[model samples]
Target chain A: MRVVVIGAGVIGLSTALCIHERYHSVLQPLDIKVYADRFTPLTTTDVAAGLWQPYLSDPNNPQEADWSQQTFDYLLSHVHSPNAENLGLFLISGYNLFHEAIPDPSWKDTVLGFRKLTPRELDMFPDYGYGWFHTSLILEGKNYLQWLTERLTERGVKFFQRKVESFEEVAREGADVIVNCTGVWAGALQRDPLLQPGRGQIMKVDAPWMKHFILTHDPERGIYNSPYIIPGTQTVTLGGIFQLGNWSELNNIQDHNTIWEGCCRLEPTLKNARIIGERTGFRPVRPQIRLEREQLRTGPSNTEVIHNYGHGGYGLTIHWGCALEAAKLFGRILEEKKLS
Target chain B: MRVVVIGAGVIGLSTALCIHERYHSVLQPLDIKVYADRFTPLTTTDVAAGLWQPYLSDPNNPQEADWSQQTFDYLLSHVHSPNAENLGLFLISGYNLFHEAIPDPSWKDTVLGFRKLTPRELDMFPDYGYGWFHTSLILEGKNYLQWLTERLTERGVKFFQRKVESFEEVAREGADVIVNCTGVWAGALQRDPLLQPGRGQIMKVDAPWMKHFILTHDPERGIYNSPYIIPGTQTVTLGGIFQLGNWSELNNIQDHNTIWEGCCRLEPTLKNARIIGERTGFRPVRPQIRLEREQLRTGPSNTEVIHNYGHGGYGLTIHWGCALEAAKLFGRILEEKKLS
Candidate 1:
């Protein structure tokens, strides 16, 4: 099977790797090609903490729960595996705190060890209460993205560093099927208007002493901030804010002070700590995440197309699950067409 | 009186504005020249959520205290004035939540409205129980920097966009007295081994609904994340991590994800918020902010040099106070030689 995947984000790379791994196990000769201009730092995946949480994913369908479960399974399996650290991913205990109103409880079954914080733990901080705790995995996207890329490369996946507009352009080079995972660029591919840019910003600081995730919400004023400490790492990941459809990457200095002050409020040790710098990224958000297969007949032959993009904030939370579904859908397409 | 200031960061611009305003009532011909390579958006100041909390400032020294107090007073006076919005600068009612076994009570007298959060207010969140509230000012380096530049220019302070390598290079331009406020670029001027780069990273996003500041920490985990909504602007500043010397500006993907997930965990409304981009800034943090006077004597001629740099993170907080002292120092140097 000759498959072409557009984009090299977490979703695109994960999909490519999953497909390549499955094809190799089946002893099928697969030539998977990935098209992307910018890798790692430029992709939204690089800007993500890659936390293993699916509480925020809802694809307007009930199947999102299954996908979240699949993803959680993949993360847990690797975390316990011998080469877990080698895969550039690991698990950490974390608490996602919130107050006022509980949100969608769809993925509650997917997460393990989810609970609320104890009162003794709650009273330790000033002007803070109401939060949640869960055992979560942190996937270092920088290392993991490259790790996945190398794995796919070793398994015979070809990477093209140019933007591809259509499968017709890809087919001229003898690709049998095309998978779309263009993220924000999906609009140019399908001309869909529903896709909008969701801008987010963050900071990476060196605080090696931290070992868990701590999240909290302001009850008086509705706001959120959390810091996740990755083990074996000195810098904790702290952030961030949400801006819908904002395109500028300019740094707001006042925002930096607010961040530092807020963090210090959460962790007083930060009062004297060294601040590194500020960073930002854009999230390609849509009304719904799409993972569907389509067949387009051109003249005498039909080409199969599978789409797996728009994971939004839950790309890592349900990455593997969606990729598995995409693979299975491709398999069904092959079986229905009676292609060997 | 003529003053030449190099570098237009929060320190330089604030000092110039102070000098201009002070001399306006008396000297009709007060000339101040300001120079910088990049202004506003690219300036190091623009990359900070610049709160008026002086973390590394030495208050025992009268000079440092004066600067901090003067800047605070200047900001406090105009916050309620009509020009505050145009300046994009104003005092924010905020609580600086911190955790340290030993406390320094000096800031209580310096900053306006400084008081610890009440027991009731402190218990509103978990893992963060101690904090102090005050009428702290947030200087949006973007608009405020430009506003300062505008105010300074209107008052006849010459602005220049050029990089200087040495004092002699600037001396050749025909200046009576020179004030060095070159921030981190002091490394290019004087190689002070004691100086270090304090790096800070943050992200800015649009969250118009957020009104007040939210701060909390995971006490046991040592992870701190706080979200803040600045006064006046809809764009909220979310951050940050303080790493001593790291300088890579590219968005670290793993950190980005951690920030995003952490933030979303706190405010589920941000699950789909837009992501702008990342920013990095290196603050020249030293033991003390410099405000010294030096006498220069050439073979047949001479120039007076008043050195004032190294304000660290509290440059804006104490700018006017330091400028007044620098002016006094300059006056003393001239008085001994019968020049003033």
Candidate 2:
């Protein structure tokens, strides 16, 4: 079957690359094309923390929990692969500090090696008694996405830098199916008022020694602290305030003071830490997480359409799982020779 | 006593213009020297939202309140003055929304027309119960700074663009009182460790319907609202995230997404807003806000050095007040010298 995917984000690249390998070996040579305005270093995934965290979820859905679990398991399986460790995509330690007891036991069950911090460990922070530690895989979106694109290319998938305004633009190229993975751009195409952009800004520092990850949540003071230290990278990923629906790309001088001071308060070694760069990105959010296959009849033929996007902040964490489900659904549709 | 100010940022040009009238009548003549790396549309102030909000202040300092209050009053007083409105220096309505009540009233009292919104008004936002509306002054830092510099130029002040590494570098160029108005670049001049750059990136969009300013604080959510839109200017400034101790000036795609989505959440109008441009600037913040007089005794003579910098993010709001205080101190210092 011929398919076209819009956007070149981690989601799009991974999905296309995955299907290309899985189907190319068994099924007839499938022609897949990716259309994007920008690719590679310019993609949003390049600047993402690339950590496997899905805090911002569409609360209206019940299937989200199951999908998250499935994705986490798949990534975990990949971490066990031989090349995972060398590629800087393996399980690493994690922690989330809190001043009060967290009621959710599901958090403990969700992570691979989750446990509570002891009293001795609590003394180091002195600020909090509640904290949890676990092991999870770290995916650097920049290198990983590049790797994924190369793999897809090797599998004979075609890519085009096409700034598509609508799905009909893809139809002009004559394809069997149209898959939409345009992040924030999806709003204009689908006219989905429910889909919106949530801004997340971050600073990349040049600290190399930091190896462990930590986060503290104290909602009372409007303070959410996360001193995550990702391994294999010199820079410690200190974030981040989840600002909703802001499109301004300028840095707030006021916010800078709070961010720097807050990070310093969490970890004093940053006193002399050389700052690398600053970045801001939008998380494409929607009231509903859409992943469905559709059939549209135009003129004399019917075109298969699959709606798969709006992961919000969890694109990396659930990319594989969502893509797997999407591919499976496509297979089911193709088996019937047409989508419902 | 003659005073010369350099650099035409909120700090530099304000000092020159504020001291001009007083110097002309009271002193022999005040020659304000304007040496800017870039003037007018190129300066960092042109890209700012120009709102007068005090950020990053010590709770112990009362004078900080005086500075902002004095500037706010001064700006409103000159609202109808020649070129005041064009300078982007005018009073506008605003709302400061917070989920939690501010315990200290002193800071709140400094603002004029301050009052809490009714329960109904607060109900406009979910989970937010408290807010205040007031008339505050915004420095169209662009026009005002340039106008101030031009005013000084017509008054016989000298203007140059030679970058200075030290006070001695510009001091040798023959000026009585070398007033340092360099913002983020003063860390090198002052040679003070207390000073560091807080890098900020912002996005300016072409949306001119948003008139009133909104400063929102989500009760338990860190910070999720972008307020202060000026549609009259046909541009809405949305942003921003604070990154600490960063100095790199490059653009990041992830940061772009965050800003886009965050702004959209505040007002969906931005979904269609044309992105005008993106900018990154560093705010120079120091432990001690400097506004004192210094004299360097070299070779066989003396050069008066007046330290007036480290305003951080509040540079625009407190610029005039600080400049007036600096000029007053300069007069006192010159009074000690015998008339030629």
Candidate 3:
């Protein structure tokens, strides 16, 4: 079987890897290729804090838990493997504080060390009504993406640093199946009217002493900030705003200060962290993440296409889960087509 | 430096493997040997369902959370690795149903797909007040042990199928350090008065139709039965009683009936499952799991020993975590002795 996965972001790479890994035995010598115009250091995934938490997307979406759970488990399984450090996989403890008492989240059982803040513990933070401590996986976006590329490359999945103009172009190029994971670019490629660009400005810093991750919802300020001091091999990723409908991919000093102050509010020790570099990208936001398969008309034959995008800020958090589903859908399509 | 790890059950094998994997490069050409009296089918770990859940220990212990979290992440990381199938690691989704409203567990975040059962969802079963769905890791004991053995053997760790009469024997036999993981046999080896025996009976059945794992706590049925229907590679593990202070290893058909009925209540389809076999083992119970270092006088030298046992039913769940700690402790001992 031949497959072409468009986009080189976390979702695209993960989807390609999943399809090849899961179906390799059933369909040996699988031909797979990943096509992308903007690679690492230019893609939205490179700017992500890469913390394994659901954000921006609708929490009420029924498939939300399943997608995040699959990715969480998938990344977690690599936390201690021989290549874990190289693959940029590890665990970090943190807190998620809310202004009002909220019922435990749907993901309460999937993370490690999830416990409500005690009365006295809540007293430490005056405005928070409820909070929970949890251990979650963290990834260094650049290193992790490269690691994924290397893994897929070693498995015979080819990569092409070229733009995929459209699903039609890919199908006409003779790909048996097409997987679209163009992120915010999907707004133009798929002409998805519902897709909204969420501009995020994140920074990496040297905070050797900062260990825990924190996400705070400040209702008074009308801000939901994740001051996640996500640790990496050499630095820490401090995240900033999730401004919906913002398309500018330029660093803003105002967002930078907000990020630093927000992180300092959670951990005063972060005040000592020195800013390393800042990045900006648009998170592809929609009411629902698109993960479906369709039959597209090519030049002379019908082409099977799988759409997997619109994960918003949760691209890494839910990539593997959605990719696994996409792969299963691909298998179902193959079976339905009676193609072997 | 040289080390001798006693016993070859899950705990001992994992401890040896952890030491080598984590510190092999740091301490190159280190000599290690594993001594065991009974291996594989004769060991208690062989009879265990090997579900990755914490039980038979104090949940309030500070170290308890760290140990289990470490092991949970470690095992979970391997669930989808290149060698996952051969290593007996994979993901399974199931319910941890309860009879009454209960607070979320400490490990709620550590497992995947951890969500509370909705009212309508719980309505499917008549006897449950609260319940949760979780995705956890499972290990086929025999295959996992063999996998660990293979991993260590490839790393040059030697194995000796001879019993050591005492810690003194191990140290005097040209070993620099000893790791004691004798499980229930530690009661006699360590001579600790707090040690107690917990009798457990587990039965395997052919139930390929069963997909999800189930853990039910029926308070109405006293504190004896844990109608846990755990899924495995080839069969389903239906378990069982955790009878404290019960040293007998005999399988009681009466207990079997209770287990069968209890599991059938949760999963009626199991009624069609054909019973394959039954096995019994004595769990090493104590007020607290002993995971510490000891200094022993043997002949002319003081033998440094790390004790890592008494986990009871959680040997599989926390073995890797405790082993990692033990390995780190051994490093500390070597440093303190100025041996490295």
Candidate 4:
């Protein structure tokens, strides 16, 4: 299993860990190398708030609902693990309020304590029609990515700090399968019309006093950006944008002011919060996740490739699930005819 | 296959690393816990001169010669690794001269460039009856132990700084096997009447001019302690004594003088070398290396214990070899009756 598992973000690294967890006992041989341009502190995963709710995602996408549930179960199982805090796995409860009444999510039963916010709860935050309150998990991305990188390093997974330009060089290596988990950068390597970058800008603030995650989603006026203040273990993340096709890494002051004002309008205490830093990153969006086996070798017994990318903003929420399926796919590939 | 492999020193780490290298694909589980009161820079392995030729070690022990060769092969393989310089592994050539003529060691067939020195070489060093020159490996123990520590950490080897008083505490953790590599401290945890501590003292000096590893063996007296001057990647080490049954930690001035004088006589340029600090260590001596499996269990499903210790000064010389065999022993046990 010479998997050229490319990508070092949460998705890339998580896929490697899952591959080891799933196939280590298969006792079939494999070499997993995660090629990436940047690692941990400088990765796309490092900027994420890492809260566990499918954000800006499609409900009807194939296997999307099941992946979310599997990820939730897998993550929830480690709530009390010894290094849980170190890995930033937590069982946190939160509310997702909206400007108008919205349909109950297709993932209603997929989470815990899922129910509509009552009249009194809705009245507490005015101008919002209906909302849902539920308990969920948060795996803080920055520290969690660091932990995952360290773990994959321990499990004999090697990481190379090289930007993989294309599958041509990877296929030249004669690997079993090339797991293209380039995430947001997938289009750069393999062009897909469905793959589009949804740029997101969020500010990290020191709001230790903020306990609950508040999401005031204004569907009609997306200008102010659904202000969400998620209090993860590391930092309180105040999210502010979803600019499709925007690839700018620059901080937009006007956009920032709107979210800051919106967050203060919901929770006035955030006016006293200290802004640690602001980061802008593109969330890789597609029709849905594109996890499938492709590229039969030039010769039957030679190298082939399997792709696992396009999780959009739900990369962390669904990484483990996609990896589990990818491992099974890999197993099926190796079992058939076999690779050199 | 869950192994509570104790000891963070060279022996313990080597055993863990060996298991991963040998059976990682077994997908078999062996949780390695290097439980020790202290690790690395503070360990007995740190003070060693780390030369490849065994010092005061038995050659007739079971698989001793083969283990020596295996360890040599493994370490030599890493001489060109990226961090080899930092890890202090080198292709060093040294001279072993004696006060009297002696037979070739049992490991003679297992080493490289092993041949008796010319008459011209003996005449160069006055009063030495016989001499031998060979190309062997040198490992700077202080750096080497730390290298392995970092490596095992990256290899998913967990280290716990706790003195394991008994297998009773380890077995209760539900691990399938216990690998005891306590070295000198094995007797403290296990009832090993055969084990005894042999005291050793050495002085490291800033001798950039010293090249070859010069060992003068005076078997008739062994009082001068067969002083050796080894030039490692770090400071040159001038070794002094080995007092059987002695437990003194303080360095004796007379023993220091003999080594300093002996080294200066062997290489006249050593007299100009600047003195560094001195160190005292206890070598775990035994009739031979005690590497075997023992203990049935309270129940058929309970834990088993495998012991690998008592290599004395040859701990560095045969660590990998012993680890390879210990891992093999662990595999056979797990295969016979699978652990839950």
Candidate 5:
């Protein structure tokens, strides 16, 4: 049986990869095809900050922690793997400063050496009275997603660089399962009214001098609300903005100043950096990530559908877990098929 | 070099097991000795519900979730094992009801298929407007802990039935490393001001007819408060009370009526159940669990100390992870020892 994944983003590719791994005994990688008009540098996940810590997430998602934790564990393993740099995944650590005091995040235990900043240490960021010092993982989307797509191809998973309108089209191709990972675009296809566009504008800069990432939540401050400096193996991701319901793909010059000015303020050396890349896209916003199975009867034979989109800014942070869960749902789908 | 672990509760035994497994080449099972005044049938853990869901824990304990998740995974493996009955662990599904609306808990994802109860299901409990239906694990401590102790003994870990005075006693024993698992009793030994006693009262009743567990929070319902009925392989545990700072081991006759009355109200068949046992003890209460290394300069040389206590009521739920952490700390301690 064939599986059609209708997105070339991390969420889609990961699902196709997982379907191949999990159902490989019965379904070959070549049997799984990812159909999308965008891939790698064009996808939202390709521009994603890819910091391992979860941000811009809704706690209402029941499986968010599991997905986030699973992804962390997977990244942590690859952090020590040989040729890890090729994957564009590595360990990074620094301060998550805040203008106000706050409790430890729900995922504090999921990371390494998560602790409150000491009073003496807070002096380093006197403007921010509260913060935490912990190690995290960073996946530079430019390099990472490119390598991921290549890895999927190398494993024999077919890739079709074309737009897949809906499951109705996949039914014409005769697939046993359909994996939907269309992100914000899925709102029109699935009629998901809850899914909105959380527009994010980030800039990539070449700043080899910066050694650590810096995230400061200067809320209620005069300006520059929440700016972050996420250092990658080769470049740094300076971000960001979360404009709910905003879907403009064009880079807002205002955001460019806000992003650059705030990052420059936190890391003075950023002023000398060169902006080499720009990423502006909409994160699929929902009350919770959609990761469940549905049955589509558009074809003569019913096709199993697994929805794994709406990851928001945490797509890479939790991609692997949701992919595995798709595989799990596939197991049930296949079992039911065999039973019938 | 021998390692002495004080206290024979689930925490200590699991730590001992971990130390043995993690450092077997350097520290054999026979080299590990456990000292305590009580064993499975007598220790507080012997009566623990071991329901796998975390309850009565401080959020400040950063590693609690890690430990709990690890224990849940470990128990899940045994749930499918061949001799699961011998381990006294099995899968259980039930409802958690509340008089008021409540969001999904932080651990809703940790368990299997956690979902909100339907209004049709709410008809099952007319008083509860909000509830959750999820699958969990039940570990009858009477059988599980007893098996664990036996496993330790068979594995060659020496057990000394005696009360430990303090680290001085361990230092005098000529032990190179000391593992403190003394729970609430460690307050005086460690000079910890934050440690307090949370007295608990629970009863064991034989109920072969009971099929599932039921937990309800009926606070301000005139009397019952939050009562639970946890079903095990052989019996069910009816509880509970958290009388903080009221360190009385003697049974509170009022709680007996409260427990029985509430449990009976939830499950009418429980009224026919026969009471077989009762347990009243103090749970170790600290803002956060203590699982760190301390250097003790007692006797001629320094004895590396590892404290692994302060797990309030969620001991069994998170024991294995903490045990594994103790092993991680032991690696450091031994590395430091070889440095000398």
Candidate 6:
């Protein structure tokens, strides 16, 4: 089978790897090709803080936790595996502070260290009403995107760097099955009226003096600074403001200062830290993430297209999980074709 | 006067900017030029975690704290000034946990919120014997470097991107005075045997969940993770392993994982954070940071050279302080020569 994955962001690359991993073991050797106009250091993945929290994801979605748990379990297993060290993964400790009472996170059990705020811990933040500390995985998209791309290449998947306008263009390339993981661009590609853009701006910096991660909601002041300090191996990423329907990828100096001030309140020492650079991306947001399979016919020839996008800012957090589910759907379609 | 500054790293740029700022006010109309083989994003300054704390400085050096404090105060002033937000200055909060008792840091009075850990706070880490929390300014070198460079350029400082082997070469370019701030490269430039390399490795990541900056010394394990998490305007920088003489710039997977693991033990949530990239730099180390002036007779004409290098990892923390001193020395020389 010839399978082509569109979009070189985290989702597309991960879906390609997952499909290759699963299908290769099933004795159904497939010819896979990944296509995208942009790659690392340029994609939305680079713009992401890459923290593994479910930001802007719908909790009511039935498959949300299932997909997130699957990816969480897989990443947790990698953390224990020998390659974990080389895999560019880490278990960062931090807090999720809120102004009002809220239920436990969906992936609470999936994480290694999950606990509510003790009275003593609560005393630390006299401003916040509730908080929790947990150990969650941070999937650095910069390294992971490149790592997965290399792995897919090593597994014989071909990569094409270009933009495709329509499904017919992919079908013309002789792809029997096409997986669309085209992040925000999917809004234009699929004509997904429900798929809107959630613009985000972030900055990368080098402040090694900070340690713990923080997510807080200051209700009295109407401030929501979640995932305020995400430490990585190279640069610390600070963010961000969410603008629905804004398409500007340029960094706003005003937003930049807001982030700096907000972060300083959380950790004042950041006042003197240097700004590495700024990044902007429009997240493909929908009412809910789309993960389904469909058939498209062009000139009497049929091409199976499996959609796996609309993750918005949660792309990095749930990329691998969605990829796994997408791969399984691809396998079922193949099985159904054989039975038919 | 034609004053040429060697190197475009943090120190070199800061010194150049300082000279321009001081000389312009005097109506001396000095022609300042900056020459370097590299610029920001390519220099050791890019690899730096850029925390404001003084690390690995000689206690016996009387001028160490004086210079550092001067820089700290200047940066603190900028924090309050109108340019604070645009200058990328921030004051972040963090803990300095030590197994052995240590005196209060020299710049305690220079920072905003300085306090010893409470008994209950100390109890949170039964492993740590002592700890303190302070609000220190973190100068983001990336932004500051560029900002200074742009300011210097706007002020008519000619920037030449090239490599010069010797002081005579700079003199040949008709520079009446040269300030050398070549960092680790100074070892070869000055042929000063006392000047050695202090190699450091760090990672930049996006763990927005992290807020506090941690500096810890684990005496029982004979390990230290100081400047653990530095929150920046963009990304949090995680460090670091300091090897006295290691010169290799390649990122070590072993050291990378060790940082991940070490950070995980400190804040377990770090394990989930993704690695943006790994960076390596050789800090120019000496008994003390060299800040002196000399009159070198190159050929027939004498070239006044100011030596300002060997910061060894505290470049960002003390660059402005040393720049001010270097500027004062230049002014003294100009007056002594009756050039003004």
Query: Which candidate leads in TM-score?
Result: 6
Q: What does candidate 6's lDDT look like per residue over A232-307, in tens digits?
A: 7567777746677888878888878877777766655566678898878888888788889989977777899999
Give DockQ per model, in order: 0.01, 0.01, 0.02, 0.01, 0.01, 0.04
Model 3 spans > 4 angstroms off: A1-340, B26-29, B56-60, B219-224
Residue range B1-340, candidate 6, lDDT tens digits: 7889999999999999988888877746578888999888788887776668875334457777888888887776565454554566755667788876777776776564566775534544555778776656777777778788778878888888999889997798788889998988886667888777777778788765455577776544332334366666666678857777788888899888877776666665566677887888888888778898999988886889999988876888788879998999999898888876
Taking the tens digit of each residue's C-alpha lDDT, what string does model 4 give over A1-340?
Answer: 5778888888788888888877777656767888888888887788888878875344656577778889988786665444666677765545788866778877766665566776645654766777886656788888788888889988888888998777877777667678888877888876788988888888888754344577777767562267888876646889868877887878898878876887777765566567999988878888788889887544445466778888777888888888888888877876785541
lDDT (0-100) at residue B298 of candidate 4? 40
lDDT (0-100) at residue A247 of candidate 2? 74
List, in order, the clash count of every candidate structure. Answer: 60, 33, 9, 2, 0, 83
What are the RMSDs of all candidates, in order? 16.5, 19.5, 15.9, 27.0, 20.4, 12.7
Chain B TM-score, all predictions listed? 0.84, 0.88, 0.94, 0.92, 0.93, 0.93
TM-score, B chain, candidate 2? 0.88
Model 6 segments more than 4 A misplaced: A1-340, B27-29, B56-58, B80-86, B123-126, B218-227
Cα deviation of A85, candidate 5, in Å: 0.9
Instruction: Report the lDDT tens digits of candidate 3 across residue range A91-132.
Output: 565567887777677777777657776554455455577887
True lDDT of residue A327, candidate 4:
81
Give the clashing residue pairs of candidate 3, or none.
A77-B76, A77-B77, A109-B108, A110-B109, A110-B111, A111-B109, A111-B110, A112-B109, A112-B110
True contacts kept of 3: 0.00
**What are the chain A TM-scores of the candidates, in order?**
0.89, 0.90, 0.92, 0.93, 0.93, 0.92
lDDT for B156 (candidate 4): 86
Q: Of the candidates numbered 1 and 6, which has the greater DockQ value? A: 6
Q: Write the per-residue lDDT of candidate 1 for residues B1-340, one digit (tens) a residue.
A: 4667888887778767766675556554456898787777787788776667665224545567666777777776665454655566544444455554236546566554345565534443344557765445666677778888888877778888888877767666666677777887776776777566666556676543333344434334332233332322435566644455556655566656656655554444444445665676767677777678666663246767777777665676676678787767755655575643
Chain A TM-score of candidate 2 vs. true chain A: 0.90
Which tens-of-lDDT digit does each residue in B157-209 have in candidate 5? Answer: 88989987678887887788889988878876778888888788898887643
- lDDT, candidate 3, B157-211, per-residue tens: 8888887778876777788788998888886676888777788888898864344
lDDT of 2 by residue, A1-340 (tens): 6889888998788778766666665566478998888797776676677777656223467677667777777665554333442334644454567888866444356664456765534554656788765555577777777777777788778889878886776676688888888887687776888877776666777543233466667675432223343333435566645565777666666555556766666655556566777666777777757888877765567777877788887788778877887788777777787432
Deviating ranges (above 4 Å) for candidate 5: A27-30, A56-58, A218-225, B1-340
C-alpha lDDT score of every prediction, in listed order:
0.64, 0.65, 0.76, 0.75, 0.75, 0.75
